[PDB]
């Protein structure tokens with residue numbers, strides 16, 4: 001009503017607030033630091049970078065590169081701060097963390113339409129409100145969210161298995177079927193006893209992580225994620241010794257995860273192991289497995305592609321809380337949530353970028369992905385439609401970059417009111 005609330009002044013909240021301010025909407029920005037600190041933060045600055053100083057690859061074949069370009073086109077404060085705080089990095093956008101957060105803090109605090117409240121928010125603020133409290137959302141607010149939307153719709157940890165691009169799978173080595181109690185729609189990669197022997201040992205030499213389960217017993221994976229019972233390999237007419245199952249994560253079916261392969265392994269180790277699996281020898285991993293302390297919402301059950309809560313008009317989520325991972329992804333979802341909150345205040349319906357753009361692909365995934373055990377997502381090429389034709393993958397990716405950027409730009413140009 002009076003000011004739009006933004007809760008959390010991290011990557012997402014800072015961009016959401018800036019977007020609101022640019023559109024002339026008064027903001028009340030809550031930040032608990034430094035009255036209360038998270039386990040990861042060390043300063044009282046807005047948009048503090050808590051770990052790596054990289055915002056991702058800048059290249060035209062890089063999905064993060066496309067998102068960076070989109071955010072610049074959008075006039076992002078995070079991208080402005082990043083460009084001005086650049087430090088050397090081959091192919092990646094990397095920043096002087098202190099200069100980055102210092103600049104953002106000064107530009108926001110200096111804005112006449114911004115009120116900053118240095119307090120912990122313990123209940124969802126009434127009115128028009130963007131929640132952007134991040135992976136270390138205070139326990140009070142996490143509790144409040146559980147009370148409002150359901151215990152099972154907020155997680156405190158992620159445990160994500162690797163997701164591969166469907167088109168990169170050798171389907172001649174797989175079969176579609178389900179075990180007892182499963183959908184008949186899982187993809188099954190059968191393995192012989194000898195193949196399992198080598199795979200098990202590889203896991204040892206590389207929620208409980210799958211590699212740890214393997215360490216605990218030879219048969220543990222065979223009772224669990226690699227269980228073959230109730231499956232018949234059409235090729236042999238027999239039950240396989242073991243399988244790796246894949247399940248569809250996205251609505252479009254471009255993105256399939258390895259079932260029960262949540263892992264904390266280094267990304268290069270994950271790639272090497274995955275490519276041992278029959279059918280996945282040349283698989284392209286678009287989202288690597290991780291296991292982190294990470295508070296986030298079940299976006300597919302709770303949020304629209306507009307980042308507005310489906311059952312709470314004028315309430316939005318952005319950043320890690322909304323189900324993304326990455327500084328840039330958090331800033332970008334902050335932009336969209338701030339944009340839609342501003343539009344709401346003004347009496348205009350919410351918007352979302354096209355499925356061809358990286359931000360559009362990201363938020364559409366959040367809203368439409370498989371809700372069961374939903375895990376966070378970062379920018380990747382699986383999120384957008386393929387490029388048809390018989391070109392090389394590099395050329396195809398460049399085409400997806402150009403197509404997405406043009407589509408995002410056209411979308412921006414159509415906005416009324418326009419971003420100044």
Ligand SMILES: Cc1cc2nc3c(=O)[nH]c(=O)nc-3n(C[C@H](O)[C@H](O)[C@H](O)COP(=O)(O)OP(=O)(O)OC[C@H]3O[C@@H](n4cnc5c(N)ncnc54)[C@H](O)[C@@H]3O)c2cc1C
Nearest residue numbers: 008010011012032051052121133134138319320326327330
């Ligand atoms: C340990 C760790 C390392 C990470 N390393 C990387 C990395 O290397 N690269 C990468 O891309 N991403 C990394 N991330 C993941 C993620 O991209 C970042 O956490 C990113 O900053 C998320 O942006 P955000 O705005 O959603 O959350 P944050 O930047 O954490 O901002 C949330 C803000 O909300 C505040 N807040 C929380 N609760 C309340 C409350 N109730 N009231 C008021 N304020 C509140 C917090 O103090 C914080 O300022 C890391 C995360 C963690 C936890």
Ligand SMILES: [Ca+2]
Nearest residue numbers: 083084085086
């Ligand atoms: Ca500089």
